Structures are given as structure tokens and as C-alpha cells.
């Protein structure tokens, strides 16, 4: 059975980086005191 093969593959097909579009864009936008 499949879990999310078409799920993650769909995200990588939409934006560029898979884990670089949700917490990374918000980490630099609101980092300041890190």
C-alpha cells in the first residue's frame, strides 16, 4: 500500500524545495533574535 508517494511528489512539483517552503521562509522573515 502507499502512504503519500503522490503527496510529497506533488509538493516538489509545485514549489522548488520541499522542506524549504513552510518553516524556512518564515524563519528568515521573522528571525531577528535567533
mmCIF file of C-alpha atoms in Angstrom:
data_model
loop_
_atom_site.group_PDB
_atom_site.id
_atom_site.type_symbol
_atom_site.label_atom_id
_atom_site.label_comp_id
_atom_site.label_asym_id
_atom_site.label_seq_id
_atom_site.Cartn_x
_atom_site.Cartn_y
_atom_site.Cartn_z
ATOM 1 C CA UNK A 1 0.000 0.000 0.000
ATOM 2 C CA UNK A 2 1.178 3.601 -0.496
ATOM 3 C CA UNK A 3 1.223 6.277 2.233
ATOM 4 C CA UNK A 4 1.890 9.601 0.471
ATOM 5 C CA UNK A 5 4.013 8.920 -2.634
ATOM 6 C CA UNK A 6 1.834 11.182 -4.810
ATOM 7 C CA UNK A 7 1.517 13.543 -1.824
ATOM 8 C CA UNK A 8 5.153 14.633 -1.387
ATOM 9 C CA UNK A 9 5.850 14.192 -5.120
ATOM 10 C CA UNK A 10 3.054 16.742 -5.663
ATOM 11 C CA UNK A 11 4.666 19.349 -3.380
ATOM 12 C CA UNK A 12 8.079 19.012 -5.071
ATOM 13 C CA UNK A 13 6.249 19.510 -8.389
ATOM 14 C CA UNK A 14 4.636 22.759 -7.177
ATOM 15 C CA UNK A 15 7.408 24.743 -5.444
ATOM 16 C CA UNK A 16 11.182 24.261 -5.645
ATOM 17 C CA UNK A 17 12.489 22.909 -2.316
ATOM 18 C CA UNK A 18 10.167 20.513 -0.467
ATOM 19 C CA UNK A 19 11.193 21.385 3.112
ATOM 20 C CA UNK A 20 12.172 24.934 2.081
ATOM 21 C CA UNK A 21 8.628 26.324 1.740
ATOM 22 C CA UNK A 22 6.803 26.485 5.095
ATOM 23 C CA UNK A 23 9.206 26.886 8.040
ATOM 24 C CA UNK A 24 12.315 28.200 6.246
ATOM 25 C CA UNK A 25 10.541 31.144 4.574
ATOM 26 C CA UNK A 26 9.028 32.044 7.967
ATOM 27 C CA UNK A 27 12.338 31.546 9.813
ATOM 28 C CA UNK A 28 14.124 34.282 7.831
ATOM 29 C CA UNK A 29 11.046 36.526 7.532
ATOM 30 C CA UNK A 30 10.696 36.597 11.337
ATOM 31 C CA UNK A 31 14.112 35.600 12.732
ATOM 32 C CA UNK A 32 15.738 38.664 14.339
ATOM 33 C CA UNK A 33 16.593 37.328 17.816
ATOM 34 C CA UNK A 34 17.578 33.749 16.905
#
